Amino acid sequence: IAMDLYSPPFVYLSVLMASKPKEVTTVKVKAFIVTLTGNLSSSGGIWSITAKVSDGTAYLDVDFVDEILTSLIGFSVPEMKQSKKDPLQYQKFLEGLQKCQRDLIDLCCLMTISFNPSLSKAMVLALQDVNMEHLENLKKRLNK
Amino acid sequence: AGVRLPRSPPLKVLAEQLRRDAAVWMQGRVVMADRGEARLRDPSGDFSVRGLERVPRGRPCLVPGKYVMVMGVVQACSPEPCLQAVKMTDLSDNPIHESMWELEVEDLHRNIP
């Protein structure tokens, strides 16, 4: 029994590759960021960043939903703009920014990932922090 | 872009698994940390890592009692497995990672022929 489609607590990247999906698909891996593949962008009025992540089965280039970043930085793009008018507000941002960098350094958890098979690269939608309920999900899956 | 890493994905492995049996994924409590190196403890046993010399860090200080994941290149399995750190991640935030980790490995190994 290896249809790891929705089998909790998370699934694997190689399972998804091996399945070869016809259209856009949603999974949870428990992954970590290997590197950042690009600069942090604020273009289009929102945050974006390309990292390469992994779950032990494959590597994956991901983009990041503006929602995640705003929370990690505590600042939206427009709040960033106004954090200039006031310099003390900028300071507070500059922190949120290396705070963001710290976060991504130490980031490892379940990632709701949206894989596009055609244009080949995925896009991280949520980050679930791994809890004890997930722990028991893996006990049952390993037939205990 | 400004990056370079091994062709095949980091494998979830335990100290023992290496010690008994090239780019890997291991975790463990920090037993000793000094300069560019540190010795870790997972439920299987102990393993050394070098080259922290050159990995990114969230906190400037790697202290004993922390729990961390290492993506490393294997060095010399005998007589206790050494690693060459490529990247390292701090998991001390979450007490679960420790509990979970032993299983995380089995589950991967069931799922890859």
Binding site: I33, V34, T35, L36, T37, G38, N39, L40, S41, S42, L97, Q98, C100, Q101, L104, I105 | A1, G2, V3, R4, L5, P6, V55, P56, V73, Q84, V86, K87
Partner: peptide, 12 residues
């Protein structure tokens, strides 16, 4: 002017 909170890595 520059952003890119960039953590990033090589080996060898």
């Amino acid at each position: 002017d520059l952003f890119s909170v960039t953590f990033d890595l090589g080996f060898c």
